[PDB]
C-alpha cells in the first residue's frame, strides 16, 4: 500500500461539492469527503472500489 494512502484527504481551493473516496487508515476502510474540483492529492478516488483496490 502506497504511503499516500495514509495522508489526510484534501479538499483544495475550488468550490464544487464532489463526493470522493479516501482511505482512512484508522477505520481500515475508504470513506467519503467533499472535494472542491481542482488540485487533487493522491488519496482521492472516484469509487470505494478503486480506493480499496489501491489502499486496502
Swiss-Prot record:
Disulfide bonds join 5-55, 14-38, 30-51. GO terms for cellular component: extracellular space; serine protease inhibitor complex. The keyword Secreted applies. Keywords: Disulfide bond, Pharmaceutical, Protease inhibitor, Secreted, Serine protease inhibitor, Signal. One of its GO terms (molecular function) is potassium channel inhibitor activity. Residues 5-55 form the BPTI/Kunitz inhibitor domain. The record marks 15-16 as: Reactive bond for trypsin. The keyword Secreted applies. It is found in: Secreted. Coiled coil: none annotated. Its main location: secreted. Inhibits trypsin, kallikrein, chymotrypsin, and plasmin. This is Pancreatic trypsin inhibitor. It comes from Bos taurus (Bovine). The chain holds residues 36 to 91 of 100 of the full protein.
